[PDB]
Symmetry: C2
């Protein structure tokens, strides 16, 4: 699995800065449970939470959203059931014609 | 206010090619109600749906995801509770400075 926003948050900010999850939650103005879920990759990053992270850490909102975007695509590429389905989808071309 | 993926789908694909909701549904292989919810913005365009649309209309997945991204950004920017809140957030640079004083 690609690097999640949670991975980046824990390994490149929290640990290097000696910052606790509860301190971050306070800085972000969200419940501790929301930060932990993000870090354990249990909840996808929302646009709103991306803005909060951008604020606290002084980055663009894009930076956080792109990490989530790459993970999202990875999840669909690796779901074989979904891939098989995309396999028999007929395009608007073959259709409009026939 | 950006054009939702639903509007692009309806006004730039379904109507110029006279393709029905039900017709697109059977192509995407999803229930008619999912397509209708996408078009009316009651359901966000998901990553999987983006893959299906990409396949049916021969586009990239991001062509669709970028449209939903624009809507997501608009929603946050026009939510006053969130904006005031974002305005009150203390940065980590500030916080760490304060913490070291204690």
């Amino acid at each position: 699995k690609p690097t999640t926003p949670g991975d980046i948050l824990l390994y490149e900010y929290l640990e290097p800065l000696d910052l606790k999850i509860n301190e971050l939650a306070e800085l972000l103005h969200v419940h501790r449970n929301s930060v932990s879920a993000l870090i354990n990759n249990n909840r996808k990053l929302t646009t709103e939470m991306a803005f909060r992270l951008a604020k606290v850490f002084d980055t663009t909102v894009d930076f956080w959203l792109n990490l989530q975007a790459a993970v999202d695509l990875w999840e669909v590429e690796n779901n074989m059931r979904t891939q098989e389905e995309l396999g028999r989808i007929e395009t608007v071309a073959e259709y409009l014609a026939r």
